[PDB]
Design a protein around this ligand. Structure first.
Ligand SMILES: CCNC(=O)N(CCCN(C)C)[P@](=O)(Cc1ccc(NC(=O)C(F)(F)F)cc1)O[C@H](c1ccc([N+](=O)[O-])cc1)[C@@H](CO)NC(=O)C(Cl)Cl
Lengths: 219, 218
């Protein structure tokens, strides 16, 4: 099959900026009839994809002047001269010259804002859950930017990956920040065998990793 | 011009399901049609194209399992799925290809709203709800919604009263079940003084759990 590669995965832009998205194919996308079937789509949340550009550079009807496509062979580019609010979403390139037709992984267009440090919170397991034999320790890291963040869980000083479940929200429409939830779930049994449960995050807004801890013997 | 797909739902691994795509506003028979799926991971994948003249092209991984067909007299496109497997889980879109046999042009110009297909061994299950209270200017509280099925669940704080400062995270699928959490931030001079409850509602089971968040020493 032909592998379509898009770069970047996420693109932070300010309203009014010029955006350019790259799409590379693993082999030539030129059809035997001389044409190149490289298309571009925009998908906004809760909606289905919408055709923007067909056959490398033709604008589909109703599509504003700001969008333009170019490229040839294996390298193609989509360009948005002026990024408006309605352009936020995920852009996909697609090759229809060869079977099977394939899509690129997508490039998310997000709003740039000032760097913001996360507000971290840690929660011990509730008595209700411990009564069931389970023990989840929850860590919320809210309203930070950029989205790049690294969270590690440490129990009595040792890193633990087993039983960790992370979920990230999309960009907040109000303040343009991101929030993340990280849950370390173990058993009541092992939970009572350890003392220090630490949620530590590394983010560019701080040199020292941001730590938040809960000690079962200080409750 | 409109494409409306139907037939989606929950199916057991190895089961069968038939999707329908009803077309309106255009000469159905003069166009090629296609089904495209979008996985939970949001990846887009072409499944099959059937040309106006009847030529059929399938993705290798569904060849022999999926059969596409069209009823030109009734403006309907079908997709008979069989021997379904977890990897088939996705949103299925019906799409028109601006192409008729022989034409030098082809692209997806019209899409349906999509119909959901979930391949899994699982029964409608209520979620366990746990209050998250801390062990400062403001205070952050939460609710953990664990082990439920199927999607979705609804989470509110004080019956919509609390709307701002809320963060509900997308459900993650683990061990065949979904887990979701939600946080709310309030002025330290609001709680414990005033009550704070997360209203969890699982439409599927008509479940409605109200979990009051009470201060507690760990
Ligand atoms: C074995 C017979 N040979 C061929 O089949 N082809 C020639 C291959 C030549 N190489 C091996 C060198 P091929 O290029 C294979 C192909 C099939 C589908 C798609 N895209 C999509 O399906 C979509 F998703 F991108 F739209 C792209 C290419 O067919 C083309 C085609 C385009 C669109 C549709 N459609 O939309 O249904 C059907 C068929 C075209 C010739 O060109 N045919 C026709 O118009 C016939 Cl007269 Cl029907």
């Amino acid at each position: 099959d032909v592998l379509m590669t898009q770069t970047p995965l996420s693109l932070p832009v300010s309203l009014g900026d010029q955006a350019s998205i790259s799409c590379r194919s693993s082999q030539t996308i030129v059809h035997s009839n001389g044409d190149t079937y490289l298309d571009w789509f925009l998908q906004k949340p809760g909606q289905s994809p919408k055709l923007l550009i067909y056959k490398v550079s033709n604008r589909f009807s109703g599509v504003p002047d700001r969008f333009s496509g170019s490229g040839s062979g294996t390298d193609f580019t989509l360009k948005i001269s002026r990024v408006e609010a309605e352009d936020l979403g995920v852009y996909y390139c697609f090759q229809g010259s060869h079977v099977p037709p394939t899509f690129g992984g997508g490039t998310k267009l997000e709003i740039k804002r000032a760097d913001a440090a996360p507000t971290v919170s840690i929660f011990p397991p509730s008595s209700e859950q411990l009564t069931s034999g389970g023990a989840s320790v929850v860590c919320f890291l809210n309203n930070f930017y950029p989205k790049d963040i690294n969270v590690k869980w440490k129990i009595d000083g040792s890193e633990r990956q087993n039983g960790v479940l992370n979920s990230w929200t999309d960009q907040d429409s109000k303040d343009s920040t991101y929030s993340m939830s990280s849950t370390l779930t173990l058993t009541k049994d092992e939970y009572e065998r350890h003392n220090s449960y630490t949620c530590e995050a590394t983010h560019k807004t701080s040199t020292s990793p941001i730590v938040k801890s809960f000690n079962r013997n200080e409750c | 011009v409109k494409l409306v797909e139907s037939g989606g739902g929950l199916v057991k691994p190895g089961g069968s399901l038939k999707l329908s795509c009803a077309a309106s506003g255009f000469t159905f028979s003069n166009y090629a049609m296609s089904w495209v799926r979008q996985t939970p991971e949001k990846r887009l994948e072409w499944v099959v194209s059937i040309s106006s003249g009847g030529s059929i092209y399938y993705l290798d991984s569904v060849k022999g399992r999926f059969t596409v067909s069209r009823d030109n007299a009734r403006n309907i496109l079908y997709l008979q799925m069989t021997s379904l497997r977890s990897e088939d889980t996705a949103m299925y879109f019906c799409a028109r290809v601006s192409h008729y046999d022989g034409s030098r042009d082809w692209y997806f110009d019209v899409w349906g709203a999509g119909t959901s297909v979930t391949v899994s061994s699982a029964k409608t299950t209520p979620p366990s709800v746990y209050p998250l209270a801390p062990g400062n200017s403001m205070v952050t509280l939460g609710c953990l919604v664990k082990g439920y099925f199927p999607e979705p669940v609804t989470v509110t704080w004080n019956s919509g009263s609390l709307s701002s400062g809320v963060h509900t995270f997308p459900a993650v699928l683990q061990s065949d079940l979904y887990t979701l959490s939600s946080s709310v931030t309030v002025p330290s001079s609001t709680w414990p003084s005033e009550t704070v409850t997360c209203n969890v509602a699982h439409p599927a089971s008509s479940t409605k759990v109200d979990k009051k968040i009470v201060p507690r020493d760990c």
